[PDB]
Amino acid sequence: QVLMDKLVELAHQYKLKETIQKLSNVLQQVKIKDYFEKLVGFIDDAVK
């Protein structure tokens, strides 16, 4: 029990959820609409 409690404390010290949410926030700052528009334009050019 002491060992698993120490393991739980050690795992929670890193706070992986904060890293995940920071990564998600950074990923949400990218320009996906521009890339989608470029892909749509390129596929339209190919079809034409």
UniProtKB/Swiss-Prot annotation:
Its job: Apolipoprotein B is a major protein constituent of chylomicrons (apo B-48), LDL (apo B-100) and VLDL (apo B-100). Apo B-100 functions as a recognition signal for the cellular binding and internalization of LDL particles by the apoB/E receptor.
UniProt name for this protein: Apolipoprotein B-100
Full protein stretch here: 2355 to 2402 of 4563
Locations listed in the record: Cytoplasm; Secreted; Lipid droplet
Induction per the UniProt record: Up-regulated in response to enterovirus 71 (EV71) infection (at protein level).
Coiled coil location: none
Name of encoding gene: APOB
Superkingdom: Eukaryota
Pathological condition linked to this protein in its record: Hypobetalipoproteinemia, familial, 1: A disorder of lipid metabolism characterized by less than 5th percentile age- and sex-specific levels of low density lipoproteins, and dietary fat malabsorption. Clinical presentation may vary from no symptoms to severe gastrointestinal and neurological dysfunction similar to abetalipoproteinemia. Hypercholesterolemia, familial, 2: A form of hypercholesterolemia, a disorder of lipoprotein metabolism characterized by elevated serum low-density lipoprotein (LDL) cholesterol levels, which result in excess deposition of cholesterol in tissues and leads to xanthelasma, xanthomas, accelerated atherosclerosis and increased risk of premature coronary heart disease. FHCL2 inheritance is autosomal dominant.
Reported modifications of this chain: Palmitoylated; structural requirement for proper assembly of the hydrophobic core of the lipoprotein particle.
Lineage: Eukaryota, Metazoa, Chordata, Craniata, Vertebrata
Subunit structure: Interacts with PCSK9. Interacts with MTTP. Interacts with AUP1. Interacts with CIDEB.
